[PDB]
Design a binder for this molecule. Structure first.
Ligand SMILES: O=C(O)[C@@H](CO)OP(=O)(O)O
Ligand SMILES: O=C(O)[C@@H](CO)OP(=O)(O)O
Ligand SMILES: [Mg+2]
Ligand SMILES: [Mg+2]
Lengths: 436, 436
């Protein structure tokens, strides 16, 4: 029995408020903290902020906080919902909001409750959260799969600049034999990266992104990937480490074109590329560097450049803003053969049921699932349990810098260790972690 | 009854290994994560790392990990120590090491056990950790004092450069009426700072330090404090926000002189200052900006420049590297009247007893106590409970950016809220938080 449902305002990795939910049951108080993901992806559950500019820069979540405390708690207590029954919990949460995008009560007020409920159902079940999630998702747990961590080491996009349009440059210790080893290789390479970085670009090139990657003032992607390959090498792990890219291409999408040199605005145009021309630039990079994954290569409604590139990619194509974790958007992506992997971001749909539900359909179309963090993270380790229970084989939780990030990586350290022989590391099979 | 004492390797905010201890009792498993503080302070408990350069860059703690697992656990289980009895726990931990500086077993292997024990004693006591700590420290708890957070917003020292020698520039929302309000004011000012920063110095000036402060490439301290005062103003909180400085002066101490322009090395000398000349520069800054605290103004064995400045300071003088949390070093500092506040860093002495014990003597000499984090933090919130239980009135846990940091700030959010009317916020009385 759920006896109390409460919420408070706390801070995220960026110093911006967010919602914290506490759920009391006969077994104790369960907490959840929602991520404040830089919002980007038309067609996602809406975020609810005060907009009061004289407070938190207008990013308070005092409403959302209210939505929980004054609206949801009362009704939820009353409902006497068996927390074990996750669909039941989310159906009830969605029923109260009544909008398709959670804009009445707001996706931050609903997630919190939805994530706390699952923790309270694990305690009651007397199982570790990953196990509960395996059970809600009807995933194989014989053995459990630990995933490769896609670590953001070098940031672009949002963080600084030259023309380097590209957003995230990830390393994936695919060659590791354990999660624990993948993280060490990961870390070793990362430190290398910083030194190489500080030497070439200045001590300043060294301070980090929102996610922990160094944010050197670079021009081109080549120059970025050259920098990373030197760190792999230097770290002594050539061959064990692969690269992943997050183009976050909606970002430089203009006039049906793509601007690989933004940050002028002497918006140099004739250089601007078309779906197909970009496709060629990607293919270029593909052969020159050990890239095994590409997220958002084309813009979010640029259905034809996706479909077209996908035909000849030959590597994992991750859909993040094209699908915004919306099964409606997934189904189309699936029928258009736009990609073959889904960036699962829970606060994009706003409910745990809905999140599992979207991974389940991705997995049934033979897609992979990269579980993901938001730009604005917390100390909450929910996504560590989540990639394991879903058995995806891959997670993107940032660089091995900032505890909003190590927090999840440390958590997998703990899960792996606890699983003993019952866990196998995804490695080279990260993409179909689930079929493993 | 302590039934098992185990340890594993996990990561810190910097991606460098550190020790994690798990203590099993009849009430459950208690955990502690030790901070990897950039070591600086001759005369502190020694840090224990593998030094194996082919692993973790030679920063493994696999030994330390071993010291716990193979040496300490066995003996500790056997000892059948009442965890309630903290001195007893630490006496036993120190007895096994037998060095004054914890160099046999290493201060990281001993801290972990010492911090887990206290959490296991709270659970058993059935009180919240801050309360247990109040009890171990024999501190007033009527009411409890929430402290002002000294938030690192702008970093120098270790992070980048011009000549700006100074290390940390802190903001202290002294004028707030609640902790919850101090953090908001704090955060509001911080975001302001970033924008001002990005505008004047480039998008790059915007990425952050190890602690979360922006790390603009600045020259002088004036230019740094000018930048901060504009953010206070701009944020609309002039008068409520005060400044704290961490000169970390050991850093530019050379030939009995201080180099305020390091980063040449066309070690420009005739400009180099003497204790007294620096004292004058500080006094300058003191009148020009709302500075209410200064940490490490003079070098760690530069006893005479401290004593001398202290005479006419008229603000809080924090001893960090001069005292390295060593009561032996404190007593001297006290008899020499070098400072009037102690930076308590637990992994500097290596035991909880020893830490409380040093605050107790600082407090008896009429000093204040600023509880502190390390450069290399974790998701562990131990220091939040610790500043409250000690009733210091002040804590330095970084900027309101990075969860190794918000993690402790969120925790105080929670404690304040739980204490209800039983907690008063230190405010303007942060320095003698304890007499309050
Ligand atoms: O974690 C993510 O993948 C990033 C973008 O890919 O999140 P945000 O959208 O908040 O920047
Ligand atoms: O937290 C601290 O005060 C800093 C220095 O003052 O720690 P470190 O010594 O690790 O840099
Ligand atoms: Mg993306
Ligand atoms: Mg210091």
């Amino acid at each position: 029995a759920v006896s109390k449902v409460y919420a408070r305002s706390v801070y995220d990795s960026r110093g911006n408020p967010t919602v914290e939910v506490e759920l009391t049951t006969e077994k104790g108080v369960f907490r959840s903290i929602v991520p404040s993901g830089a919002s980007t992806g038309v067609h996602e559950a809406l975020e609810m902020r005060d907009g009061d500019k004289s407070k938190w820069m207008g990013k308070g979540v005092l409403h959302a906080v209210k939505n929980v405390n004054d609206v949801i708690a009362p009704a939820f207590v009353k409902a006497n919902i068996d927390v074990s029954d996750q669909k039941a919990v989310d159906d009830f949460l969605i029923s109260l909001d009544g909008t398709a995008n959670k804009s009445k009560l707001g996706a931050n007020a609903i997630l919190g409750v939805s994530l706390a409920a699952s923790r309270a159902a694990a305690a009651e079940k007397n199982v570790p959260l990953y196990k509960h999630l395996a059970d809600l998702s009807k995933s194989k747990t014989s053995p459990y799969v630990l995933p490769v961590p896609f670590l953001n080491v070098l940031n672009g996009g949002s963080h600084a600049g030259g023309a380097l349009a590209l957003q995230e440059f990830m390393i994936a210790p695919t060659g590791a034999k354990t999660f624990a080893e993948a993280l060490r290789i990961g870390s070793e390479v990362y430190h290398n990266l910083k030194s190489l970085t500080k030497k070439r670009y200045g001590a300043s090139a060294g301070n980090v992104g929102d996610e922990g990657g160094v944010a050197p003032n670079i021009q081109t992607a080549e120059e970025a990937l050259d920098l990373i390959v030197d760190a792999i090498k230097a770290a002594g792990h050539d061959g064990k480490v692969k690269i992943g890219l997050d183009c976050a291409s909606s970002e430089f999408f203009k006039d049906g074109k793509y601007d690989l040199d933004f940050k002028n605005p002497n918006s140099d145009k004739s250089k601007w590329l078309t779906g197909p021309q970009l496709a060629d630039l990607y293919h270029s990079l593909m052969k020159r560097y050990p890239i095994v994954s590409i997220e958002d290569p084309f813009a979010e409604d640029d259905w034809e450049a996706w479909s077209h590139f996908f035909k000849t990619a030959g590597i994992q194509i991750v859909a993040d803003d094209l699908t915004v974790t919306n099964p409606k958007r997934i189904a189309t992506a699936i029928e258009k053969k736009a990609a073959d992997a889904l960036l699962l971001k829970v606060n994009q749909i706003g409910t745990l049921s809905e999140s599992i539900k979207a991974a389940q359909d991705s997995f049934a179309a033979g897609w992979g699932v990269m579980v993901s963090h938001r730009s604005g993270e917390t100390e909450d380790t929910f996504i560590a349990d989540l990639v394991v229970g879903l058995r995806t084989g891959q997670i993107k939780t940032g660089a091995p810098a900032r505890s909003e990030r190590l927090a999840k990586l440390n958590q997998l350290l703990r899960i792996e260790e606890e699983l003993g022989d019952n866990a196998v590391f995804a490695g080279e099979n990260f993409h179909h972690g689930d079929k493993l």
